[PDB]
Amino acid sequence: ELYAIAKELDSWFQDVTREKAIFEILNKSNYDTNRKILIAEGWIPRDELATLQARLGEMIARLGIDVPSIIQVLDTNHTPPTFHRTNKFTAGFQSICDC
């Protein structure tokens, strides 16, 4: 039985880790029985809205329920986060930038 289990236990480890992590991260939103919708907020880059919509094209493709847009930008009074991109050739350079 060890021979058989070995093929799958390792995979299942990181698999189940993915589910626990995804459940946790989704759990940070607010929900109540009041509304069928889910109350959530998050912070999203602005130069990829079209890509976000296209990727949500799958949301309307197979699991479709016909509520495509979940994006509506409002304003706040707190400073936004700062972030940028990195590349393979610059693994070290970019790290020390924000270190």
Partner 1 sequence: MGATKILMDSTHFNEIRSIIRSRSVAWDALARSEELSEIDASTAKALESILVKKNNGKTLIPLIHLLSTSDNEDCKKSVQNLIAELLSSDKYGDDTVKFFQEDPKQLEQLFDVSLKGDFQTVLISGFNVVSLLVQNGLHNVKLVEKLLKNNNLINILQNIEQMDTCYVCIRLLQELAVIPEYRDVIWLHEKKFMPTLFKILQRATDSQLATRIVATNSNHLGIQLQYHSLLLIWLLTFNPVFANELVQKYLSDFLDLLKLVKITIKEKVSRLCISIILQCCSTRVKQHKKVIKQLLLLGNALPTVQSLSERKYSDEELRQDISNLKEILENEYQELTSFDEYSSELKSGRLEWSPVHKSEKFWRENAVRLNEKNYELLKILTKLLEVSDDPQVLAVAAHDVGEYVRHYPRGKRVIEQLGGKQLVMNHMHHEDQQVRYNALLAVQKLMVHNWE
Partner 2 sequence: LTPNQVNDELNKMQAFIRKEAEEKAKEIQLKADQEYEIEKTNIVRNETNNID
Q: Give the position of tokens 């350079």.
A: 93
Give CA 66 to chain center in angstroms. Answer: 21
Q: How far is the CB of 32 from partner 1 (least distance, A)?
A: 9
Single-letter code of the amino acid located at 71: I
Looking at 4, 44, 61, 91, which residue binds partner 1 (CB under 8 A)?
61
Residue number, 59 or 94, with CB nearest to partner 2: 59
Q: Which does 14 bind (CB under 5 to 8 A by kind): partner 1, partner 2, none?
A: none
Which parts of 13-72 interact with partner 2 (CB under 8 A)?
Answer: 36, 53, 65-69, 72
Q: Are the beta carbons of 81 and 87 closer than 8 angstroms?
A: no
Whole-number CA gyration radius for the chain:
20
28 binds partner 1 (CB under 8 A): no
Range 13-18, long-range pairs (CB < 8 A, 24+ positions): none
Residues that bind partner 2 (CB under 8 A): 36, 53, 65-69, 72
